[PDB]
């Protein structure tokens, strides 16, 4: 039947279709989440256990969106204990001073970093999708 | 799975500090507003004659903005040791960390 190469290409087409399906589902779930909630589009510091992330919903796509660290992924403020008021306050400082460099789960993060965020664990995008 | 992309050109003090009590955090100073505290003491300003006075702030915001800016050459007042040993201030420091 097909050569190993044709099957490999079939799997990259399948990854594209899967990522598209996942992005659309998460967009729709965002609209459903943002139905009756003010400040949904405003940055909040969220505790992921090991780190804080300043995040909100994107207004166009309704996808999760975080304050970005340079040209990499979301700025994850490493916590040194279960309760780390300093890390949380630095996250607040990020909201105040660094909020114009942002990164969004999905096709944006795919173009920018080579992964969508939704098919790797642990990752803030996947962790929100499990909530 | 996979590894998150990390731009290490951007500095973050939280990367290396593994002891949570060594991190500066802003707390209510019950008497006078807000202060920047860690296990090392309080962030300080020059006292009456080349001494050390606790740096106070009226809002948590001003304390946070000071704490997490790159300003350096900042002195630390530690109430738990001499010189200037204040037992109650030391006890407060220990109780908020």
State the share of residues found in helices of chain B, binned by percent.
Answer: 10-25%
Radius of gyration of chain B: 16 Å
Strand content of chain B: 15-25%
Count of domain modules of chain A: 1
Largest sheet entry of chain A: 5 strands, antiparallel
Largest interface (CB within 8 Å) is between: A-B, 29 and 27 residues
Q: What is the general shape of chain B?
A: elongated
How does this model look, in words?
Chain A is α+β, with helices and mostly antiparallel strands. Chain A has four helices and five strands, in the order αββββαβαα. Chain A has helices at 4-33, 85-97, 107-113, 124-130, and strands at 44-47, 51-57, 64-67, 77-78, 102-104. In chain A, strands 1, 2, 3, 4 and 5 form a five-stranded antiparallel sheet that branches. The longest helix of chain B is centred in the C-terminal third of the chain and has 10 residues, at 87-96. In chain B, 19% of the residues lie in helices and 22% in strands. In chain B, a hairpin with a 5-residue loop joins strand 1 and strand 2 (34-38). Chain B is elongated, with a radius of gyration of 16 Å. Chain B has helices at residues 60-67, 87-96, and strands at 25-28, 34-38, 41-46, 52-54, 75-77. In chain B, strands 1, 2, 3, 4 and 5 form a five-stranded antiparallel sheet that branches. Chain B has one domain (21-96). The chains are: A alpha+beta (131), B alpha+beta (97). At the A-B interface, strand 4 and helix 2 of A face strand 1 and helix 1 of B. The PDB classes it as viral protein. The entry lists the keywords The components of entry-fusion complex, viral protein. The assembly is dimeric. Crystal structure of monkeypox virus A30/H2 sub-complex at pH 6.8.
